[PDB]
Amino acid sequence: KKIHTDKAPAAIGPYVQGKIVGNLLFASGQVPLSPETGQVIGTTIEEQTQQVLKNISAILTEAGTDFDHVVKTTCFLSDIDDFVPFNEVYATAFKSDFPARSAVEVARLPKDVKIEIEVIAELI
Amino acid sequence: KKIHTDKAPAAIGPYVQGKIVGNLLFASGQVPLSPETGQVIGTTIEEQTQQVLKNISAILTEAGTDFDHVVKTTCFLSDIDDFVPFNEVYATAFKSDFPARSAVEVARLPKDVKIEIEVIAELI
Amino acid sequence: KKIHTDKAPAAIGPYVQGKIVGNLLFASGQVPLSPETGQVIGTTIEEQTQQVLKNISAILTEAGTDFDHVVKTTCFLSDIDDFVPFNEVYATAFKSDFPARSAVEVARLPKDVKIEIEVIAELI
């Protein structure tokens, strides 16, 4: 069972936005792309993370879950040095019950954005 | 329970090719190695991805699942400029049913291969 | 349910050390930090891997599982050429029932450490 919403960038190619197995939602890595203009939103890790989170949120909602039910994320950064500012904006979506996390510096990301996040979540 | 198949490269030392928990298969990242010669097959992203996918296929079969029942993949490229041909070959293992995906360039993979793909798949 | 133990590095901020969902513990990736001092432990891939493994131990223990019941790990190395020494240390924790694995070289890790391991595990 699959996720489609026009409130996050559309799956163009051989994947979906996310997919559900039992109570678990596995989302595709989200990037700082606008679901409206398809452009990269923002020029800073701060702006870009906010976009990524907007995009994740849309996916959780359409799946009938929420930020507070994310059990685990993997954060991909282009520059581990962004980590502090990155963290401040991450924390605006997850404020209370926190997910388990890994955060590493990869070499490149689609479009050389600064941040890509994937999330795994429990259904409400 | 573990998974072993002669049709994917042999698991040497402290891992297995795949492990099942409840209804879920967590397969190890597959590289374009020949289960029969123990060597890297292919000189292009195209050939290499082909072998990765065979390797993965063997494991799913062994595990009582298939590509249509793969829920989430992670595709680690040695070079994101290879993305377009990767994505064309990747598509051919699927039909209308796609998994959630992330795909990133990592700095290096075992034996300097171009592609490594981990899957998580639901058991039929 | 969130996991916390004093015997793994403390969760500074907007993650937790481990999160349970159904029968699954998803632990934050672990680095070679001392829970007592907060510093990097080890200069070699061997000593750092040991520290990581203890941090994992404390978490599995806290959650009421152990190494035998780990389904899948991801090993982020800063240098793939470290693989053999790291594999050997990696072995000392996993006796009989090995998890699936993926191992890739990232550009960079927090604090410029050589190794970070995330684990997924079933509750005894």
Side-chain angles (χ1 to χ4, degrees), chain B residues 1-123:
Chain B
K1 87 186 194 153
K2 316 292 199 48
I3 289 300
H4 178 84
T5 170
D6 294 353
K7 290 166 233 151
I12 311 151
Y15 77 107
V16 293
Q17 300 174 323
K19 195 133 180 274
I20 296 182
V21 61
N23 247 268
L24 295 177
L25 170 80
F26 293 80
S28 296
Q30 294 314 288
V31 271
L33 301 174
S34 172
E36 141 195 318
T37 73
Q39 301 215 66
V40 175
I41 290 277
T43 267
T44 59
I45 188 59
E46 286 100 342
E47 294 152 339
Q48 293 201 9
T49 302
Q50 275 285 349
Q51 186 73 40
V52 163
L53 290 170
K54 262 152 222 181
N55 293 359
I56 294 165
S57 203
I59 284 135
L60 305 177
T61 293
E62 182 60 14
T65 184
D66 64 19
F67 277 115
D68 278 278
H69 280 72
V70 166
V71 25
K72 157 79 160 77
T73 84
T74 312
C75 300
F76 296 118
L77 286 65
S78 78
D79 182 352
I80 211 174
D81 291 332
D82 289 334
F83 178 76
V84 171
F86 157 68
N87 193 41
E88 267 173 50
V89 177
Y90 177 95
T92 70
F94 296 110
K95 268 37 168 57
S96 55
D97 235 312
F98 308 110
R101 179 175 77 176
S102 309
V104 306
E105 183 186 318
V106 293
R108 227 180 138 198
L109 302 166
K111 323 184 99 308
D112 308 80
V113 293
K114 292 180 199 290
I115 180 86
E116 179 178 343
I117 300 186
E118 49 173 45
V119 316
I120 307 171
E122 184 190 24
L123 306 191

Side-chain angles (χ1 to χ4, degrees), chain A residues 16-101:
Chain A
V16 289
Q17 291 170 320
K19 190 155 169 159
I20 284 165
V21 57
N23 299 291
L24 293 166
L25 158 68
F26 289 79
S28 296
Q30 295 306 293
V31 282
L33 287 175
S34 164
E36 330 270 69
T37 80
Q39 308 294 114
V40 168
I41 289 307
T43 242
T44 42
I45 183 72
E46 288 101 334
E47 284 177 356
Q48 280 187 29
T49 305
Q50 207 78 254
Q51 195 58 53
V52 165
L53 298 169
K54 244 163 210 122
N55 300 339
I56 283 151
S57 191
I59 291 153
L60 304 177
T61 288
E62 177 76 37
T65 181
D66 52 29
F67 279 138
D68 304 283
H69 282 84
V70 169
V71 1
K72 162 110 225 281
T73 75
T74 302
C75 304
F76 303 108
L77 286 63
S78 72
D79 196 343
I80 214 62
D81 283 350
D82 295 336
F83 194 67
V84 176
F86 161 69
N87 243 304
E88 286 155 358
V89 178
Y90 182 88
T92 68
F94 313 89
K95 339 194 187 215
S96 17
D97 218 26
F98 299 118
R101 193 176 54 172

Side-chain angles (χ1 to χ4, degrees), chain A residues 70 72 87 90 99 101-102 105, chain C residues 14 16 19 28-29 107-108 118:
Chain A
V70 169
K72 162 110 225 281
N87 243 304
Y90 182 88
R101 193 176 54 172
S102 287
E105 184 177 314
Chain C
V16 306
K19 190 128 164 199
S28 297
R108 209 161 163 224
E118 78 174 44

